[PDB]
Amino acid sequence: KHNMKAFLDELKAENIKKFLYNFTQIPHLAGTEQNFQLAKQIQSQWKEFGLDSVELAHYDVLLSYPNKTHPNYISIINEDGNEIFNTSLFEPPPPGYENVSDIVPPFSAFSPQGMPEGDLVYVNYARTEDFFKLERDMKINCSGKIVIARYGKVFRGNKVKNAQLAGAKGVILYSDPADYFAPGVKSYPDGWNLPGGGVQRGNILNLNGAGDPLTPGYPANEYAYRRGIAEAVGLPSIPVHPIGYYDAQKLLEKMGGSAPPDSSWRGSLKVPYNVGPGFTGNFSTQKVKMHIHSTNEVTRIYNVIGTLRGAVEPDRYVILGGHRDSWVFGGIDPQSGAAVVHEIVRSFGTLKKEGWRPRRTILFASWDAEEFGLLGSTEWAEENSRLLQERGVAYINADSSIEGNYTLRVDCTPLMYSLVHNLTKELKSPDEGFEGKSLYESWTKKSPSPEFSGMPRISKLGSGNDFEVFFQRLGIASGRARYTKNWETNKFSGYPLYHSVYETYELVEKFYDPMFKYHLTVAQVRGGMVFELANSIVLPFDCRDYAVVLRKYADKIYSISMKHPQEMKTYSVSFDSLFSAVKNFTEIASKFSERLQDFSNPIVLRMMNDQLMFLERAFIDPLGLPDRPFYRHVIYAPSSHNKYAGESFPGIYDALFDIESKVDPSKAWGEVKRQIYVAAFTVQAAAETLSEVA
Amino acid sequence: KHNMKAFLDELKAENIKKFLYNFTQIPHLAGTEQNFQLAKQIQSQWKEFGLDSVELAHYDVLLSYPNKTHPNYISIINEDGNEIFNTSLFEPPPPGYENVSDIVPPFSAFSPQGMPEGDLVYVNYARTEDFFKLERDMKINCSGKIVIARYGKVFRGNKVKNAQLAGAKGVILYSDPADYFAPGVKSYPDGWNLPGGGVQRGNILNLNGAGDPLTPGYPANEYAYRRGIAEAVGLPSIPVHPIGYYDAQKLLEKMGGSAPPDSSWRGSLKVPYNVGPGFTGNFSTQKVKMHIHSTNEVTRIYNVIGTLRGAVEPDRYVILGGHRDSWVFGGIDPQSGAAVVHEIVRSFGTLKKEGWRPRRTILFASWDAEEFGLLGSTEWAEENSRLLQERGVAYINADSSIEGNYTLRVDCTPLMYSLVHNLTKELKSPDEGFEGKSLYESWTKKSPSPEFSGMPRISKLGSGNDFEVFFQRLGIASGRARYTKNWETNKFSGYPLYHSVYETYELVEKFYDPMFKYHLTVAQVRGGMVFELANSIVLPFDCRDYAVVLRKYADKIYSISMKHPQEMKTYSVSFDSLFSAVKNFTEIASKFSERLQDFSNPIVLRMMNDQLMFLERAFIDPLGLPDRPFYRHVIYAPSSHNKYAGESFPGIYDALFDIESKVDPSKAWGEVKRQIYVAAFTVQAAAETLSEVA
Numbered sequence A, B: 001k002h003n004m005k006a007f008l009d010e011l012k013a014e015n016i017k018k019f020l021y022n023f024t025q026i027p028h029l030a031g032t033e034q035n036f037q038l039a040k041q042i043q044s045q046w047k048e049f050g051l052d053s054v055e056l057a058h059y060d061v062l063l064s065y066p067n068k069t070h071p072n073y074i075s076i077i078n079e080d081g082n083e084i085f086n087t088s089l090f091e092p093p094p095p096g097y098e099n100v101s102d103i104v105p106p107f108s109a110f111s112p113q114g115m116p117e118g119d120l121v122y123v124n125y126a127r128t129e130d131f132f133k134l135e136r137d138m139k140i141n142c143s144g145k146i147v148i149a150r151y152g153k154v155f156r157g158n159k160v161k162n163a164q165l166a167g168a169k170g171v172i173l174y175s176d177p178a179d180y181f182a183p184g185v186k187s188y189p190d191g192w193n194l195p196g197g198g199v200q201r202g203n204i205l206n207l208n209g210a211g212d213p214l215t216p217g218y219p220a221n222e223y224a225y226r227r228g229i230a231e232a233v234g235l236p237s238i239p240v241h242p243i244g245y246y247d248a249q250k251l252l253e254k255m256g257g258s259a260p261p262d263s264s265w266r267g268s269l270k271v272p273y274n275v276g277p278g279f280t281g282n283f284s285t286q287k288v289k290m291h292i293h294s295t296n297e298v299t300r301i302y303n304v305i306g307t308l309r310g311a312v313e314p315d316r317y318v319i320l321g322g323h324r325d326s327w328v329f330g331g332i333d334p335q336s337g338a339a340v341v342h343e344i345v346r347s348f349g350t351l352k353k354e355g356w357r358p359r360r361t362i363l364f365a366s367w368d369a370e371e372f373g374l375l376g377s378t379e380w381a382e383e384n385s386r387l388l389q390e391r392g393v394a395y396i397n398a399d400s401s402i403e404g405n406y407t408l409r410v411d412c413t414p415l416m417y418s419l420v421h422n423l424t425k426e427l428k429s430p431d432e433g434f435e436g437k438s439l440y441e442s443w444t445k446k447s448p449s450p451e452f453s454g455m456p457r458i459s460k461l462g463s464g465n466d467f468e469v470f471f472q473r474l475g476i477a478s479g480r481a482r483y484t485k486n487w488e489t490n491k492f493s494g495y496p497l498y499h500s501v502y503e504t505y506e507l508v509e510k511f512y513d514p515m516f517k518y519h520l521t522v523a524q525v526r527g528g529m530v531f532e533l534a535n536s537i538v539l540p541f542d543c544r545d546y547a548v549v550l551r552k553y554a555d556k557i558y559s560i561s562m563k564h565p566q567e568m569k570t571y572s573v574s575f576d577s578l579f580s581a582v583k584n585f586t587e588i589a590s591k592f593s594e595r596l597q598d599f600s601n602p603i604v605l606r607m608m609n610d611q612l613m614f615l616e617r618a619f620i621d622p623l624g625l626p627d628r629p630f631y632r633h634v635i636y637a638p639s640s641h642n643k644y645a646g647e648s649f650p651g652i653y654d655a656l657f658d659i660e661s662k663v664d665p666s667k668a669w670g671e672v673k674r675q676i677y678v679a680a681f682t683v684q685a686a687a688e689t690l691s692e693v694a
């Protein structure tokens, strides 16, 4: 029989291991020849595996690269202008790769060029609240200073945005062992910790969903009209560069001015973590100088797009996508995900060769230039937006399959919650101590829901990966799942060797997943979800789960507002319409669920499947969120303070945020009321898509 | 049998006549009690007629009304400030209605209040080219002047916008007998011409598709947040008031300054048509003073929405809509259309009582507040946008059924051309001399296509009626048809008694359509289109017709650009991508047509019907046109100089318009290239929706 069990049994750990090895021998940086050759390899193999069509879709987008003959570095310079200390020009390469060429040195992609020299101020994680503490409580002025911030807690692009608005003239990012060195584990190559010479690469854009900075709204195809650089979307205006903790220690050890305001500002290095500005008395005349010579350049990128045509509903698309480009070898990010995708394609292709086809069309994607701003997935979605919005059922992402070996991590739309719970009850746990138990059981035990006993935690989607255009722009139900660690305060910081030259095949095979059993479990979750979405007669979405969360998010936003009871009285700020809409949604969803259970008629079925598919789409506002026109989902957007975190009712959240500091309270509360009206209207309109159609 | 012939035969001229009489005895001004009582009457009757559900949808929108105890008028005042001449406070009422109350006096809806006094300048029709002639060729400065303009040629709101940008401090609009008095016909009540005391009412907004000025984007429901008046959309900033030609003669006869520049500036009154500024020597010290005291006020409006549920595809909607509100009695505009709609509902209801239902759902609408800015249809579409965009097949408008008695007039999307040609070949001509001939034959004879021999003229949709939100915002295939005159230069000016107190039942019954045969023919066209759209197994749209017009519009926009060959060389302005996209669309459409003719499989049918329904939707750009975010269709928008006229490739058209006058030619041609890229991309993306789906 050709059922889900046949699909799942065909998946093999040893194939995933072979593919991961094959994908991680040389760097695959976006826009380079090596990554184009990998794209051609994948296209060839997906054809062999049995897909109906496999094409490359290419775009010409703005990328950023260091200058190979003019390296980036930071100095401490004395009053004579002698550079008395320099940061490293490259990470020491790992064993057996000291002769690989084309390893890009650490840099912050899209940094402008410059050689700013100044006094340092230390800004902790450079979060919005860190800058509030500095400026409002400690009265420290960052204007004209170089800021130094530790990586962690929030997306680095938010750090740079915050530093810019504070008037910084440059930013130095570094990895503190407090956040990137787990106690009791050895540094790479002897364990999975970050060495003092290791450095985290990564872009520092603030694109807000735009895609290629030069072509917002439209695909960067051959005849595209491009904005000039000065009008490009999301580029930083000050130079930025990342360093490891050996180098950071040299920059921080001389720091003077104010003590850190409290212990949450101190990392694990043997330095005082003084905030500055500038160095202590003896070194008061030394300055820090950046030298950044990176260049932005329009460069061709390639997505691989494979199609397995549906037998019954070929005009309904279930998409499984993950990126192929890596900063260096990509042992975890992204090739641990790409190897899982490759084995899923292989498995579906095996069934196809035996005569089976899915009910709906499945599209498989190997995206390019994810690391430079989700460019490949966003350009392709801009090109195909009309097909996706009328035909897109679901998007399942597949970046890193593992970032630890403790338990499952899932973020998805509430419409997928029931699907995830049901699938994981049918899968075997790979965990020690849970042999013969379900993955649901182990996951629920290790990661309990904060609301409901006997259920696991599933989080909101944020951004920082390729599902963003599909979910936040186009309103296609999306999900993602991987294996993770037990390290809650580090849930947005990355694993220790994230985006470093040390993230290699050997890292994974020695320290994370020697038997490839966690990879295999993630392949069964991602693959199983795709199978059910593409094959279930009725789409496996439960609208009642959206009704439950909408009440939770309404209670939450109401509670934030109620911190300001006098203003709510003065400006007549009522959440009544929003609660009314949520109540109506709950009632209508309950009635729709009853009909869905209660109907041989394929028109009524498809009518009902269209109601299910277009429910996520109903939360899209075509006017977008304030000053973020490509974030259109009214219930969820990436947090304005941390692109990685999802925020619920973001329009109302941002209208309320720091409202006690706004100079015109009448205008600020007016905008809160406006966002409540938009949210109540959208929830009611989404509910009405589930009413009887006539 | 229940087929189209049964539907058509049930329609009766004498029922249309009864309904028109019933709808035109008292004024039905939007927001008044009388119009609410008519809405309740219609709701009751549509229920009786047999619709499944008939509800009122209400909104609270900004309307405008004169002050009943402080009337609007214009004076000529002498140097002492004595008002030596006053315009009329009301139109003399027609015979037998001198005792009807609540006839709104002539006013320009949404005019601000003010009492500006100044010298007059005469600006012909106040078109963009009229103001170019004044300012650029004649060197006359309108700044601080009161402008007087004759109605005609373009929408009055464009006149007021043009006068504002020229620096006018007020506008006087009047009806010249050249445009509103056909030679050889008598004035009302003895013929259908405009008397010298007659005055054309009408709004002077520049909404660009926004709907209610206070709630752009969202329905004006009970909890809506409203913009303050100073941020409202589209309100004029200078006072405006309309007058008849007896009063205009008094204002124009004393005019001095420059002679009219040529004969196209002279109307038919016995005055010189001097342009001014100001009066001749003897009267040089007299001024003109406006007194405008109208008020804008948020007021409830009511749409009637009737549903006839589809038997097979109830989640596909064919909508027949027309407005109910009138300036005064609405004998032609809109009740000649509303009476046709009422008889169509009656006919469909007769079939329904015999057990028939259409394949698809038909929605029938009686819109309110059309005259104040398409408010009722736009608010309702904003409320229901998610249902309409995923389920809307087509919208057929039904305002005035007659504006003359000569031949058919049709404006529609190219997707409906084949449908209109085929239907009119099956209908009888009502025209004298064509008894026993088809309507197609008479229409083709009287209104030949300017391109093809043996075909009739069908025009582009513009705006100025309730189809605008459905077509230009949401991208639902739309059409309209009425009987018209033979008076080509007056095709945007209105019939002589347009928006006057004289547009009565007696006007229609005595002078336009005594046998109601032209009404009946229009009911067969509108009703027939609705029947075919709601009942045909395959939707009756031909994508190849869009391919033909896209080539025509591409040739046209290329020819405009080619007036500037040196700039096209300097800035490398190429239309190659646009022609490439049009060629691809032609090829793909031809292949799709072949498949559509070549497939018992209801999935493939509906897949194909969805391709047809979503083709118009593919021309929508979610980012809208430049500074007109609610005009989203890339192929068609209302002309920026004349809201009534459609413009093709409007983004490129407006980028090219008057380009030789822009100060930064590099920037201006850059924007032309940007609009060519958006248009080529959109055409190619629309084409791709017709490719095989997987």
Ligand SMILES: *[C@@H]1O[C@H](CO)[C@@H](O[C@@H]2O[C@H](CO)[C@@H](O[C@@H]3O[C@H](CO)[C@@H](O)[C@H](O[C@H]4O[C@H](CO)[C@@H](O)[C@H](O)[C@@H]4O)[C@@H]3O)[C@H](O)[C@H]2NC(C)=O)[C@H](O)[C@H]1NC(C)=O
Pocket (backbone or CB within 6 Å): A577, A578, A580, A581, A584, A680, A681, A684, B222
């Ligand atoms: C959740 O669903 C419910 C339906 O179950 C829906 O209820 C609707 O609420 C609206 C807004 O409150 C009601 O609007 C009223 O409609 C009547 C006519 O039906 C009007 O006469 C009312 O206006 C008068 O009263 C107002 C309030 O004091 C005054 O401001 C006004 O000037 C008038 O005097 C009012 O517009 C509507 O009837 C119901 N519909 C029903 C019960 O079917 C509710 O709105 C949904 N929630 C959301 C957020 O959409």
Ligand SMILES: *[C@@H]1O[C@H](CO)[C@@H](O[C@@H]2O[C@H](CO)[C@@H](O[C@@H]3O[C@H](CO)[C@@H](O)[C@H](O[C@H]4O[C@H](CO)[C@@H](O)[C@H](O)[C@@H]4O)[C@@H]3O)[C@H](O)[C@H]2NC(C)=O)[C@H](O)[C@H]1NC(C)=O
Pocket (backbone or CB within 6 Å): A222, B577, B578, B580, B581, B584, B680, B681, B684
């Ligand atoms: C109309 O449909 C046709 C398909 O029938 C479609 O043709 C496509 O045109 C594009 C754009 O011209 C082609 O793009 C080329 O793709 C190849 C690889 O396939 C690239 O190597 C090419 O790039 C090189 O050449 C360029 C031009 O000189 C250089 O600028 C560039 O730097 C490279 O050296 C180029 O990108 C594409 O192959 C075809 N696709 C086909 C034939 O299937 C056409 O674009 C459609 N029209 C519109 C407006 O969409």
Ligand SMILES: O=C(N[C@@H](CCCCNC(=O)c1ccc(I)cc1)C(=O)O)N[C@H](C(=O)O)c1ccc(O)cc1
Pocket (backbone or CB within 6 Å): A202, A203, A205, A207, A333, A370, A371, A372, A373, A374, A399, A400, A409, A410, A411, A463, A464, A465, A480, A481, A482, A491, A492, A493, A494, A643, A644, A645
């Ligand atoms: O590296 C990225 N993403 C990794 C690391 C993300 C670190 C924080 N982790 C999470 O947000 C997270 C949440 C839920 C799950 I299930 C898994 C990870 C990832 O998604 O695996 N994306 C890069 C980056 O962060 O530099 C990125 C970020 C922004 C952008 O526009 C384009 C690319």
Ligand SMILES: O=C(N[C@@H](CCCCNC(=O)c1ccc(I)cc1)C(=O)O)N[C@H](C(=O)O)c1ccc(O)cc1
Pocket (backbone or CB within 6 Å): B202, B203, B205, B207, B333, B370, B371, B372, B373, B374, B399, B400, B409, B410, B411, B463, B464, B465, B480, B481, B482, B491, B492, B493, B494, B643, B644, B645
């Ligand atoms: O009166 C209106 N429409 C009438 C008169 C339009 C006069 C010009 N005629 C046409 O544009 C036309 C084109 C094709 C056909 I078939 C029929 C008429 C109508 O459409 O019958 N609409 C009113 C107005 O013009 O004051 C209007 C205008 C703008 C607006 O936002 C809201 C209402």
Ligand SMILES: *[C@@H]1O[C@H](CO)[C@@H](O[C@@H]2O[C@H](CO)[C@@H](O)[C@H](O)[C@H]2NC(C)=O)[C@H](O)[C@H]1NC(C)=O
Pocket (backbone or CB within 6 Å): A022, A023, A025, A040, A041, A044, A045
């Ligand atoms: C990764 O695996 C691929 C596919 O097996 C290898 O590419 C093949 O290499 C052989 C021997 O050079 C050629 O004959 C084939 O044409 C290739 N097939 C393709 C590209 O589809 C590739 O060598 C492996 N890469 C590494 C680093 O081991």
Ligand SMILES: *[C@@H]1O[C@H](CO)[C@@H](O[C@@H]2O[C@H](CO)[C@@H](O)[C@H](O)[C@H]2NC(C)=O)[C@H](O)[C@H]1NC(C)=O
Pocket (backbone or CB within 6 Å): A081, A082, A083, A084, A085, A086
């Ligand atoms: C840090 O690097 C800088 C730049 O290479 C070094 O300064 C240069 O030293 C060479 C030879 O000694 C001079 O000819 C250059 O003119 C210097 N350039 C600049 C920009 O100062 C510096 O010596 C290095 N410092 C340390 C401690 O290694």
Ligand SMILES: *[C@@H]1O[C@H](CO)[C@@H](O[C@@H]2O[C@H](CO)[C@@H](O)[C@H](O)[C@H]2NC(C)=O)[C@H](O)[C@H]1NC(C)=O
Pocket (backbone or CB within 6 Å): A418, A419, A422, A540, A541, A542, A597
């Ligand atoms: C997850 O599994 C549950 C339990 O099987 C499914 O809920 C059942 O669905 C069937 C079919 O409609 C009903 O007859 C039962 O009454 C349901 N049991 C319940 C609600 O406890 C549920 O549909 C599955 N979720 C999916 C497929 O998304």
Ligand SMILES: *[C@@H]1O[C@H](CO)[C@@H](O[C@@H]2O[C@H](CO)[C@@H](O)[C@H](O)[C@H]2NC(C)=O)[C@H](O)[C@H]1NC(C)=O
Pocket (backbone or CB within 6 Å): B022, B023, B025, B040, B041, B044, B045
């Ligand atoms: C227009 O026609 C309607 C419907 O026939 C008339 O309204 C009816 O009036 C009678 C007598 O007053 C009442 O008994 C009914 O209740 C009404 N029916 C409705 C409103 O559905 C109305 O009188 C006519 N109007 C004019 C001006 O002739």
Ligand SMILES: *[C@@H]1O[C@H](CO)[C@@H](O[C@@H]2O[C@H](CO)[C@@H](O)[C@H](O)[C@H]2NC(C)=O)[C@H](O)[C@H]1NC(C)=O
Pocket (backbone or CB within 6 Å): B081, B082, B083, B084, B085, B086
């Ligand atoms: C035009 O109307 C104005 C306003 O009603 C007339 O002027 C008024 O005349 C009365 C009585 O004669 C005075 O008490 C008012 O003070 C005047 N008002 C203003 C604003 O001037 C004027 O007489 C009328 N002119 C003509 C020719 O009829």
Ligand SMILES: *[C@@H]1O[C@H](CO)[C@@H](O[C@@H]2O[C@H](CO)[C@@H](O)[C@H](O)[C@H]2NC(C)=O)[C@H](O)[C@H]1NC(C)=O
Pocket (backbone or CB within 6 Å): B418, B419, B422, B540, B541, B542, B597
């Ligand atoms: C209008 O009528 C023409 C002539 O009947 C229709 O075109 C024919 O359609 C049938 C069914 O597909 C074909 O088999 C013929 O070959 C067509 N004749 C032609 C193209 O000359 C056309 O489909 C009708 N248009 C509609 C319904 O929109």
Ligand SMILES: *[C@@H]1O[C@H](CO)[C@@H](O)[C@H](O)[C@H]1NC(C)=O
Pocket (backbone or CB within 6 Å): A067, A068, A069, A070, A295
């Ligand atoms: C990189 O630096 C070299 C060496 O100084 C210089 O000649 C070249 O212009 C730079 N490359 C760029 C800016 O792409």
Ligand SMILES: *[C@@H]1O[C@H](CO)[C@@H](O)[C@H](O)[C@H]1NC(C)=O
Pocket (backbone or CB within 6 Å): A141, A142, A143, A144
């Ligand atoms: C910070 O310093 C800059 C540069 O001198 C100054 O212009 C600015 O006003 C200062 N801001 C505060 C809040 O002290």
Ligand SMILES: *[C@@H]1O[C@H](CO)[C@@H](O)[C@H](O)[C@H]1NC(C)=O
Pocket (backbone or CB within 6 Å): A192, A404, A405, A485, A511, A512
């Ligand atoms: C794998 O799991 C073991 C057992 O708990 C743990 O000690 C080890 O560090 C894990 N590896 C990683 C990378 O977390």
Ligand SMILES: *[C@@H]1O[C@H](CO)[C@@H](O)[C@H](O)[C@H]1NC(C)=O
Pocket (backbone or CB within 6 Å): B067, B068, B069, B070, B295
């Ligand atoms: C209309 O004019 C009257 C009479 O002068 C005045 O009292 C009232 O304020 C006005 N009504 C308005 C502005 O609605």
Ligand SMILES: *[C@@H]1O[C@H](CO)[C@@H](O)[C@H](O)[C@H]1NC(C)=O
Pocket (backbone or CB within 6 Å): B141, B142, B143, B144
């Ligand atoms: C028109 O007159 C105004 C008012 O005095 C003046 O400011 C403006 O510059 C003039 N414009 C032209 C084009 O002469």
Ligand SMILES: *[C@@H]1O[C@H](CO)[C@@H](O)[C@H](O)[C@H]1NC(C)=O
Pocket (backbone or CB within 6 Å): B192, B404, B405, B485, B511, B512
């Ligand atoms: C009706 O048609 C006749 C015959 O051509 C014409 O003389 C008459 O004026 C028409 N009525 C109108 C309003 O056009």
